Design an enzyme around this catalytic site. Structure first.
Site, PDB file in Angstrom:
ATOM      1  N   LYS B 170      -5.444  -2.425   9.234  1.00 40.10           N
ATOM      2  CA  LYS B 170      -5.505  -3.459   8.213  1.00 40.10           C
ATOM      3  C   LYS B 170      -4.222  -3.376   7.395  1.00 40.10           C
ATOM      4  O   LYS B 170      -4.111  -2.537   6.501  1.00 40.10           O
ATOM      5  CB  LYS B 170      -6.699  -3.274   7.272  1.00 40.10           C
ATOM      6  N   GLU B 243      -0.975   9.594   2.583  1.00 36.79           N
ATOM      7  CA  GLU B 243       0.412   9.788   2.178  1.00 36.79           C
ATOM      8  C   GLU B 243       0.681   8.830   1.048  1.00 36.79           C
ATOM      9  O   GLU B 243       0.630   7.611   1.219  1.00 36.79           O
ATOM     10  CB  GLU B 243       1.382   9.572   3.342  1.00 36.79           C
ATOM     11  N   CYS B 280       8.718   5.798  -0.716  1.00 37.62           N
ATOM     12  CA  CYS B 280       8.065   6.974  -1.279  1.00 37.62           C
ATOM     13  C   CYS B 280       9.097   8.067  -1.570  1.00 37.62           C
ATOM     14  O   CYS B 280       8.968   8.825  -2.542  1.00 37.62           O
ATOM     15  CB  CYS B 280       7.013   7.479  -0.290  1.00 37.62           C
ATOM     16  N   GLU B 374       6.587   7.042 -11.183  1.00 31.92           N
ATOM     17  CA  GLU B 374       7.262   6.459 -10.020  1.00 31.92           C
ATOM     18  C   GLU B 374       7.712   5.013 -10.285  1.00 31.92           C
ATOM     19  O   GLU B 374       6.894   4.138 -10.536  1.00 31.92           O
ATOM     20  CB  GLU B 374       6.380   6.538  -8.754  1.00 31.92           C
TER      21      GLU B 374
END
Ligand SMILES: NC(=O)c1ccc[n+]([C@@H]2O[C@H](COP(=O)([O-])OP(=O)(O)OC[C@H]3O[C@@H](n4cnc5c(N)ncnc54)[C@H](O)[C@@H]3O)[C@@H](O)[C@H]2O)c1
Ligand SMILES: NC(=O)c1ccc[n+]([C@@H]2O[C@H](COP(=O)([O-])OP(=O)(O)OC[C@H]3O[C@@H](n4cnc5c(N)ncnc54)[C@H](O)[C@@H]3O)[C@@H](O)[C@H]2O)c1
Lengths: 473, 473
Positions: B170, B243, B280, B374
């Site tokens: 998905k 992750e 990331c 972040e």
């Protein structure tokens, strides 16, 4: 009377947990009714201490522990027998397994499994190397069942030591004394005390802290499915290694001679009764192909009758009690329902309290509670199955579990077929399902685990983080 | 208008999800608003299908897919840039990464990492060998983010195919079209259609089925921290590889010559801006030791000013947009707040909708939202840190993240000290945190992930169950 061992200190509470000898139900010891604060305190200590032991130093501790277990084996097995009720024969064997655990963990310390990658591999390549190495976690939470009050703790603690981790153990309230003793032995063997705590208490006050404490990076657990599910529900973001039940078969194929049928019978009886049948890998189902059943069953009955069952402290006893009377009565009840349902009880000299004979039941219905429930006792149940391998494999795979298995045949073609087709973590040819070395990969699928391997080697890997680094080359 | 791909079948719904080009917010495509039933069908097909592909056949499929990606790189890159908004330079590079993923996965098909153990090792030893084997799971659930619409999917799907698994993907509703194209490419390359479905829809309709379906043995998810933790809580009893984000530093040590400071500046600017900073492992914190900062910062500023930022379909563009206006505005506001807190903005040409220039800010306080949290955008933030490695490492380790890192230095002692001391999954010496080969172990700790590695090799291993078997010897 034994306080908790918290990073080398004794810690006690007012309230206490009595530990009873299942043979006669007398109190043999007490341990504290520890609470959430006690685990929290142990985890704070684990988290703050950064082990700096060299591989050599870790090996020394682990091997010293091994030799201490060997030298003190009569003392240790006494403690195991007095709280669990298994025979001294089984207790002493368990000390020998723990001796292997620590020996093998100590020896595996010399091994560095780091890898090297060259990076000039593709159009995106660079003149560079990547190297790998392992580092320990913040803290490990270990929760153990009554099954092997020593070896279960050994399997969770030895690899943590070998990898410079700090572990906190909460053994079952039913058999905590063996764990507290192992802690003493470790401290005396030179383990920095912050690297190990053993806390005790009722699950309803300290168990949750073991699962949810913020310093815990990994929870390693052995026990029942329901409790396993409670752990996974509450240990949200944490790594988990869960070893949940088994329902393991010993499969007897129809190619066997009479002489081999007798050897298989030895396997069936040992597998169904070792440790009073209390192993996740105990033979819980003997699937005997119909056409050898008539020759096989008598051989099993004859072997089962040679089994000495009674006083577990008696050095002659083969088979001691199960964990308590309530368990013993339940198993007997399942044996009775099976008989209601078609099974032939061939040997049942009678139950006294928590002492269960090595009951032999033939023509066990595969769907009976006796087989489908976890009958965690020394019942020897023979299910007659079709002389068709596809049907046997289908039946074998029909439970919610998938841990281990044993298969007795001399036909390689069939051997391959079962190895490939059984939905389990291990297929042993000509051995009981519970056969393994203490360092080979161990673990199951389906309801038997959450999908990770244990054993000394895989445990050491699970208890570390791999870190990579790259250098211009 | 693109239908879902359910095991090769084009599957439509009346309701649709609009996919918009972030450069001008225009609709470039539409996919179905799929529901639980579609994912449920996809998983049922996955579970029922037992791949029989030889290693050769898998390799053939995987290598044909790589050849097709290379042959169609421009076409595929167009689709990526139209839904994500990253420059063609960046999207072409992404296709190259997916090319490596498929190539290396195909080539790893020949590898059998089975082990053998001798059993005659201890007093409990037997004349016996244990052998080790890998088997696939029932079904794999893969959930992917917007930042690599092709490569994130490739990393989840190539290893599944390589291992005879069946996967249902998905993709994010923000960039689903790249995933649907990869599926078409896979079917054309000869993949049995049952081994791959790609379903689409709002998370509120289909997301729960992805993580909760009974056939799902493993959920592999890449995405944000909050979603990750929500998945961890709703996927209770399932294996998970999560992750999550990073907040990765590029560390500039005070041993560097001026010539080296310029090379470091090149790394700082590339690593902070590649893919519009949407990695990331992007450089999100440039930790420059005080005594070289006055020389280093102008070198960074000079490099930032050369970057061409604009229309991502222009081949002269280095830097395209971020994913949407809301993201860009958030990033800008953090820059402005950093400045009211002491930061010095050295370069800010002005933001236009989702297009952010490569803003350079010096003297960023390590506690400002800009670097403490972040910031998934092409910001170039310099944090001045003490000329003290211990202090620098403590500062580097002081966020909730721990994925990768880069360190620029020529002093081996210091290099070693950082490699050992940074709390991260990867330390790259003289490269950006983002550098890796597609098959090396990749994964972080703390909030960066739940502690399992991926990359092609480690994913292949995680996507299997290890079976052992033992034979008389
Ligand atoms: O022993 P067994 O073989 O009977 O299996 P079991 O699953 O009942 O017990 C295994 C271990 O889990 C512990 N435990 C039980 N309930 C718990 C809970 N609610 N929270 C935390 N830990 C719990 C037990 O004390 C034991 O240590
Ligand atoms: O990654 P990102 O940077 O795109 O941010 P993100 O974390 O929001 O998205 C990651 C992926 O998770 C999906 N997702 C979001 N909420 C979900 C949920 N509640 N259940 C299942 N999947 C969900 C997204 O659609 C996307 O595919």
């Amino acid at each position: 009377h034994e306080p908790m061992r918290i990073a080398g200190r004794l810690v006690d509470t007012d309230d206490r947990v009595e530990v009873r000898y299942p043979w006669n139900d007398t109190v043999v010891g007490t341990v504290p009714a520890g609470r959430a604060e006690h685990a929290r305190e142990a985890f704070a200590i684990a988290a703050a201490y950064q082990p700096k032991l060299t591989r050599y130093e870790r090996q020394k501790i682990l091997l010293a522990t091994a030799e201490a277990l060997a030298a003190r084996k009569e003392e240790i097995s006494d403690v195991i027998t007095l709280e669990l009720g298994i025979s001294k024969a089984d207790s002493l064997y368990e000390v020998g397994r723990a001796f292997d655990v620590f020996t093998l963990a100590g020896q595996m310390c010399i091994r560095d499994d780091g890898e090297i990658f060259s990076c000039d591999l593709t159009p995106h390549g660079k003149a560079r190397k990547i190297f790998t190495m392992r580092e320990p976690l913040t803290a490990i939470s270990a929760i153990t069942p009554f099954n092997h009050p020593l070896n279960m703790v050994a399997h969770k603690v030895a690899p943590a030591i070998a990898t410079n981790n700090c572990v906190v153990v909460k053994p079952t309230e039913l058999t905590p004394m063996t764990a507290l003793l192992l802690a003493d032995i470790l401290y005396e063997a030179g383990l920095p005390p912050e690297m190990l705590s053993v806390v005790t208490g009722w699950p309803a006050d300290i168990g949750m802290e073991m699962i949810t404490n913020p310093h815990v990076d990994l929870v390693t657990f052995t026990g029942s499915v329901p409790v396993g599910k409670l752990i996974a529900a509450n240990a949200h973001y944490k790594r988990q290694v869960l070893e949940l039940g088994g329902n393991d078969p010993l499969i007897i194929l129809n190619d066997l001679s009479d002489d081999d049928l007798a050897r298989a019978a030895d396997l069936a009886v040992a597998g169904a009764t070792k440790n009073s049948g209390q192993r996740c890998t105990a033979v819980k189902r003997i699937l005997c192909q119909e056409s050898v059943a008539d020759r096989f069953v008598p051989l099993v009955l004859e072997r089962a009758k040679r089994l000495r069952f009674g006083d577990p402290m008696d050095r002659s006893t083969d088979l001691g009690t199960v964990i308590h009377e309530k368990a013993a009565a339940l198993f007997e009840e399942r044996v009775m329902r099976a008989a209601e349902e078609g099974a032939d009880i061939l040997y049942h000299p009678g139950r006294s309290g928590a002492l269960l004979p090595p009951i032999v039941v033939d023509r066990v219905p595969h769907q009976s509670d006796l087989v489908l429930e976890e009958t965690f006792g020394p019942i020897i149940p023979i299910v007659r199955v079709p002389d068709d391998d596809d049907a046997t494999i289908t039946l074998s795979n029909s439970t919610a579990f998938g841990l281990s298995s044993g298969v007795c045949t001399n036909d390689y073609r069939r051997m391959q077929k079962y190895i490939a087709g059984l939905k389990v973590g291990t297929v042993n040819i000509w051995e009981v399902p519970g056969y393994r070395i203490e360092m080979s990969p161990f673990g199951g699928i389906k309801d038997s685990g959450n999908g990770y391997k244990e054993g000394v080697i895989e445990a050491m890997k699970s208890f570390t983080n791999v870190k990579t680094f790259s250098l211009p080359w």
